[PDB]
Amino acid sequence: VKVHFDQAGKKVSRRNARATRAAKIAPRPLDLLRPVVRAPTVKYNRKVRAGRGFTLAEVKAAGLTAAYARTIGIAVDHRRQNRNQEIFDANVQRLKEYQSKIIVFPRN
């Protein structure tokens, strides 16, 4: 019989983990820019949720390349497909807004 006594302990663990990741990845926002996706099954199709990664198509239409996308902190998925038109539009707008916000520091 397991008991989760460490609910308070592991929240403090997880928070300090994020604090270290903040200290090491200083200007960057801890997590990658994830897409916006329509959920499967009749029950949940009304819900629109955070997907895994974009696509080569959504990345190419935004105005950047796949390998470069990952270095600027955009999660890229390759097995996901662009069947829906409205989702495609929403993600492209999401990337273009993100590209206006980003400030990529020089390597010198």
């Binding site: 994020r18 903040a22 090491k24 200007p27 926002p29 801890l30 993100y98």
Partner: peptide, 29 residues
């Protein structure tokens, strides 16, 4: 450790997320 401009402008009395809002930069996308 990774940015000197941040190293000067980072209140350790504040948390992670509070420090980001104080600066301007987004802490979560």
């Amino acid at each position: 450790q990774s940015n000197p401009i941040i190293a000067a402008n980072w209140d350790y009395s504040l948390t992670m997320a509070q420090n980001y809002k104080k600066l301007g930069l987004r802490a979560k996308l």
